[PDB]
Each structure stands twice: as C-alpha cells, then as structure tokens.
C-alpha cells in the first residue's frame, strides 16, 4: 500500500515538550488526509498556501511533521506572523509558511490529579528564535549586568518552566497536542539562470573588501537575477572550482531555485574540508556541507590582501565543541568550553577554555598555512521529484 506513517506521529503515547519540539520526516509514501481528518476529533485543522479540500490531489517535494504540547490559548501562536511566549521563544513558523497546523485537546491523555509538570516551555531568552529554530539550552538566564557564575538567585534564573495540567482546569489552560505539517510545493519558479529563461551581485560577494571568519560564516541569498557563470570562471585565478551534484561546464544552461552564497576564510590545507563527506577541525566544528550537496565550492589564495607584517589574527576558527555541527549550521557562541566534570562558572583556567582561536597569517608563511577566501554556492535543482502524494495523485 505504502501509506504515510501518521500513526507514529499523531497516535504516539509520548509527546514532546514544545521547547524541545520533535520533528519527523515524511517521504516516499501516500497520505490520505481525509482519513486523517476523520481519524480524530480535531479542534484546529487549518492550512496555509494550499487548500485543505484539495489536499488529496497534491504532491510535495519535502514534508516534515513537527510535534509538541502547548496550552489551549497558545494554539493561536502556531500560525505565521504571530507572537507570544511560544512563537517568540519556543516554536516559530516563517512568514512564507506552506503547510497545515493540526491540534486537538489532550486533557484525557496529558493530565493527572496532582498535576502533570513534565511538559515544559522556555520562558526567558536573549532574543527571538529564527523560523524553525530549536533551543534545548538549559543555561542560567542573566537578567542584569553581573554574570551568574553557575548559581541561581536574584537576576539569575532557570530559563525553562513547566505547564501545570490539572483535570479541573479551564479549557484555555488545558493541554493540546499539535502537529505541524510543512510542505514544499512541487512546481517551483526558477529564481536564477544563465543565458536561458539584471545581473547577479557576484562582484559584491567575491570582491567584498571584508570577508568573515569561518565560525561566523556569511550567507547572502542570490535571487531574481542572471548568473554570469561563464565570466566568473577565469574572472580571477582560482585554486579551486570543484562542483557537486551538477556538471561544471553546464552552469549557464542550467536553471535553479533558492540560491545561496556562503563566504569565509580558512587555511590552505583546510580547503580540502569544504566538500561533502569530509571531516576535520573545520568540517566538524565550523562549516559542514551535507553528503547530498548540490553546488559549487570556489576558493582563491589571498596572501596579498589578508596577511600583514605582524599578522592577521582577526580570522578566527572554533577549536573545541561538545558535538559536531549539523549540515549548514552556524555556531557563534563564546561560552567557556567545559573540558572536565566540574562546572566553569564564567572563569577560564584548567579544563575551562575559550572555544575560538585566531588563524595566524604572517606573509612569510608557507602555502599550507596561508589565507584562502572561499565562496560556496548552494543550489536547489529545478523540477525535483515528488516525495509525498495523496491517493488521487
């Protein structure tokens, strides 16, 4: 039959706390959405950028099903453009959201007579979440000017807090389970092309006066323009122009969507790492390309423009981290890395280290330890296959 696993998603005994919202991927299957609509007594079943009666006649490129519990009166916040605790600090949908938002009352499952305090929400944060960001941090929130140094008290607060789900509760203070299906619509308008069907700011990117450090890599979106891929090749003397997922001679001919240009600086012998399935200091902890990557990596020696007599220590890299980066993740944190079992309490010493370090770039240095400005062009291939469909197709 090959039906989609909405049993796993909707029927699960265990549901996530909104702050640590769960994501399941849905692909290579056939979803009967009207079976879904009758499957339970939903309180909210709404869709954005797509008609819910026409769901069975549609096919999508990507699908994700996100799962969590929030209060009844917080369900309002699981739409685009909204604000409040949940939208701002826990789960944010983008303004161009294409998908559906399903919810139902959960009070029989998720209440208890004493109270169920196992479901949590982030209360304080330094800034609002970007769309589809997830923050699982449990670090002490600093309300004032003094540091907290690992100890709670005044102006020093735990950032999470639990919902109190009683049975004898108002309906707006009762628990609600929420599924959020996110689609990518199959037929996708092309935004960047060569001679087929004014110019893209490739001079702006490749000849910027200032380039960013590798840990804080800089993404610029390229869209609604003509890509001069022939003229780029042999614009300057590039040491690298290796391309993945598409041929390096047919760039003009080709047409794609959702183009991005990621620019940064690394050592020469580290250029190797800017490519799929690679590991090392940079690929593990600074900039990671996915295995299924579709794009072009362009890099040039920069020794005349970046180095200087004393050195250029402005270009940093992340040295220590708790885990490897996910593909296309950026980490800008400057929190003390804890090497041991004792906490660090905002003071550096043994087992308590600053995670960044400067690349040393004096002009005397060999080719291995020289600066290389790297631009990574990231494409989305036009007319991608469908992955999830309805019975009617």
């Amino acid at each position: 039959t090959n039906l989609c696993p909405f049993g796993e998603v909707f029927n699960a005994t265990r549901f996530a706390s909104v702050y640590a919202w769960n994501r399941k991927r849905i692909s290579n299957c056939v979803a009967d959405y009207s079976v879904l609509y009758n499957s339970a007594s939903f309180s909210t079943f709404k869709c954005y950028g797509v008609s819910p009666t026409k769901l069975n006649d549609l096919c999508f490129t990507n699908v994700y099903a996100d799962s969590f519990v929030i209060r009844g009166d917080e369900v309002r916040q699981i739409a685009p453009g909204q604000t409040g605790k949940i939208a701002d600090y826990n789960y944010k949908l983008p303004d161009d959201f294409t998908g559906c938002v399903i919810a139902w009352n959960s009070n029989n499952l998720d209440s208890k007579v004493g109270g169920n305090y196992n479901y949590l929400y982030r209360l304080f944060r330094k800034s609002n979440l970007k769309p589809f960001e997830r923050d699982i941090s449990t670090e002490i929130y600093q309300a004032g000017s003094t540091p907290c140094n690992g100890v709670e008290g005044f102006n020093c607060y735990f950032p999470l807090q639990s919902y109190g789900f009683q049975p004898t509760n108002g309906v707006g203070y009762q628990p609600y389970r929420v599924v959020v299906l996110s689609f990518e619509l199959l037929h996708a308008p092309a935004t960047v092309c060569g001679p087929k069907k004014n110019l893209c700011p490739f001079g702006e990117v490749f000849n910027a006066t200032r380039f960013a450090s590798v840990y804080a890599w800089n993404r610029k979106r390229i869209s609604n323009c003509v890509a001069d891929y022939s003229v780029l090749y042999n614009s300057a003397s590039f040491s690298t122009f290796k391309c993945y997922g598409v041929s390096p001679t047919k760039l003009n001919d080709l047409c794609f969507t959702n183009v991005y240009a990621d620019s940064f600086v690394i050592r020469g012998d580290e250029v190797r790492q800017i490519a799929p399935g690679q590991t090392g200091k940079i690929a593990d902890y600074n900039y990671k390309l996915p295995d299924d990557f579709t794009g072009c990596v362009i890099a040039w020696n920069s020794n005349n423009l970046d180095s200087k007599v004393g050195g250029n220590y402005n270009y940093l890299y992340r040295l220590f981290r708790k885990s490897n980066l996910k593909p296309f993740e950026r980490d800008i944190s400057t929190e003390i890395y804890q090497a041991g079992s004792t906490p660090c309490n905002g003071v550096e010493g043994f087992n308590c280290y600053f995670p960044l370090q400067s690349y040393g770039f004096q002009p005397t240095n060999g080719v291995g330890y020289q600066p290389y400005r790297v631009v990574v062009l990231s494409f989305e291939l036009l007319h991608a296959p469908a992955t999830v469909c309805g019975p009617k197709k």
Partner: nanobody
Amino acid sequence: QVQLVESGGGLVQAGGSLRLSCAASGRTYTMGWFRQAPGKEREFVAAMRWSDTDYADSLKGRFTISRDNANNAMYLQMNSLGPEDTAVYYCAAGEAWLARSTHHYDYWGQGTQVTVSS
C-alpha cells in the same frame, strides 16, 4: 531599525502624578523604562513583554507600565512622586525578557526630563 519617541515629561509638585508616553515605529517586542540622574548611571525602572510586567522593587506600587496595542505606544504612570524621582527618563526596546539592564535593549528614545520639587 525601530525609532522611539518619548513625551509627557515636565515639572510636578511632590505627592503628584505624571504620565510618560513612548511611540514606536513598529515591531516593538520587549519595551522598558530607565531613568538617569545628572552625572549618575542609568537605572532600570520597569518593563513589559507579552502582557507580563517587571518593575524595580523600590518603585513597584507607585509606577504602572501599560501598552496601547492599536497605537503601537506604551505609557508609564508615575504616582506619589518625590525628589528622588528627578531624572531624565528613557524608553527602550529589545528582544530579551527579564531585561533589567542597558545591554538587554537595542533601541533607545531621546529622553524626556522630569523634575519634582517638595
């Protein structure tokens, strides 16, 4: 880039009231009030986010922070004023909750003066 414009500050007699007002460009999020005496640092007064308030402990009962959402403006109702309340009052905006210091805010107003004689 958000722009903040204060008003309502003047001279008051002791035991009196005042109502300061801050009008914003748009997309306000967390908004709060500080005050600065001459040759002294800024001092958090009060702030609000998603209908939760936060006041400084000395002045919580007297002062009242509120928002008119339709106008995109907030107010501060200062009551029972004394000589210690005399300062330039600033209005600020940012994205952090429990913002009780300068660093937590991104955008600042011009600064309405308040003076209080006994």
